[PDB]
């Protein structure tokens, strides 16, 4: 057993807070729910607390806690995310939407008491008002992805790369190219992994009793690629 690991042996409550600004449209999102890394499983619900969300909900999924990924026993030594806990890590991304604008995000993921909190600032720029994002042409659904993880020994963190595929209502696919880096908040030693991947599955839904703009999210994530 290990320190950060042991914080995730059971169900953990989750709080997500996102402060956003896309092409000058300011918004805030709040989410809550639970994660269980034993199963790589998240059950979350998000609300746009400012009113209507100015971008499609699927474009925020990756921004809105990879410490809940299931790392199987033979891969425990490669789980950077939990090893940084409880003091946590900074997650930064640039997300390039093909033929459109980009998101830049900075999040702090850490424990506050017994709750795992993901606090995010998002800035979006150069989006086309008639594009798929500001034009709300993305289907309300989500695909399965492979997330590629590499150590950044020089910076005592990891680098993460992957391509998100967003289905467009006309049948095409909008590519969202993700560049990610994570760095521990604390000075304690962390696990720096060999190259590997995560396999993701998500489903988005709606709460029939919720009047606010919102997203219900079920997510399963498992690490693999080490023998």
């Amino acid at each position: 057993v290990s320190k950060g690991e042991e914080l995730f042996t059971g169900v953990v409550p989750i709080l997500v807070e996102l402060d956003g600004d896309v092409n000058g449209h300011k918004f805030s999102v709040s989410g809550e729910g639970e994660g269980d890394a034993t199963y790589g499983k998240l059950t979350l619900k998000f609300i746009c607390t400012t009113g209507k969300l100015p971008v499609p909900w699927p474009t925020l999924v990756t921004t809105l806690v990879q410490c809940f990924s299931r790392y199987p026993d033979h891969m425990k030594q490669h789980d950077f995310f939990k090893s940084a806990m409880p003091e946590g890590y900074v997650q930064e991304r640039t997300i390039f939407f093909k033929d459109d604008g980009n998101y830049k995000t900075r999040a702090e993921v850490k424990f506050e008491g017994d709750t795992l909190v993901n606090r995010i600032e998002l800035k979006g720029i150069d989006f086309k008002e008639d594009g798929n994002i500001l034009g709300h042409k993305l289907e309300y659904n989500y695909n399965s992805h492979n997330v590629y993880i590499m150590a950044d020994k020089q910076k005592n963190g990891i680098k993460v790369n992957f391509k998100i595929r967003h289905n467009i209502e006309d049948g095409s696919v909008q590519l969202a190219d993700h560049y990610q880096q994570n760095t521990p908040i604390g000075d304690g030693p962390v696990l720096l992994p060999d190259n590997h991947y995560l396999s993701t599955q998500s489903a988005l839904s709606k709460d029939p009793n919720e009047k606010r703009d919102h997203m219900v999210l079920l997510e399963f994530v498992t690490a693999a690629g080490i023998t």
Binding site: G33, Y39, T43, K45, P72, N143, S144, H145, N146, Y148, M150, K163, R165, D194, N195, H196, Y197, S199, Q201, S202, A203, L204, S205, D207, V216, L218, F220, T222, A224, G225, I226, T227
Partner: protein, 302 residues
Amino acid sequence: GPGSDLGKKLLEAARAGQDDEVRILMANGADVNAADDVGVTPLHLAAQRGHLEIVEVLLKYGADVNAADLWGQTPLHLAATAGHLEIVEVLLKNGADVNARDNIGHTPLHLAAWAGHLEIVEVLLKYGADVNAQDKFGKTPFDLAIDNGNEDIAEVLQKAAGGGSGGGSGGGDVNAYDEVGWTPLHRAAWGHLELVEKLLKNGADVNAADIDGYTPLHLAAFSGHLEIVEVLLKYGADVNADDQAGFTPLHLAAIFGHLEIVEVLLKNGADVNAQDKFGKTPFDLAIDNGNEDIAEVLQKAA
């Protein structure tokens, strides 16, 4: 007010396994079908956390065995995931929908096969579970069993599908692919040398590209497995595969410092002038990543 307060206490008592508290709260008017703001009921929690006696009393007094939370999960989904055999059986005896779907499309059989609970798999099959059910990503319970290395379950599930014995060693199609375009060979490329060899001998497509454009040779170079790279090339892997990937295997080897892989790729015809989607050659990337041995070799390769 008073009722949802009692309902909340009952939710907490069922989650905690507090049998006496559950009795008292139910006697004092707590609704057995209390649901919080995300549709979770006492029966969900008792079933999830393994509290059989509470499951039984809740059912006795009219709890809805097929209640679904916002994520589509019924108590049977949670008990099947968690490995609670006796609760699974009690739920089915009380009319639980054996093929209920969560929002990803998982049936209880999916989840029990994923999580490695063989006796629960068998019980579900005996209550009519659909062995061919696919979730929204096309996965059957068999696929998830094999994805998580649950070979005994995979063997059982293949037979129940009418596919005969041998399922513990994988399906019938070496060239089957999932929604990310991964074939068995993509999965094996991450260090499973003996399986790579077996799959290629059994007709695996050595140059299959996934939804991102990656061939098994890319993945082997990314993960640093020299012997797998060698075997892939021996069976005809395209040494310069790019095609939507935006980089070749030689680019990956140069980034991550795999000198022997670089040399094997060069010996097999790798193109040193190939540019990735940022205009970088492997030599550029070796320089950028401080990989001196590799940069020397690539500079010598002209």
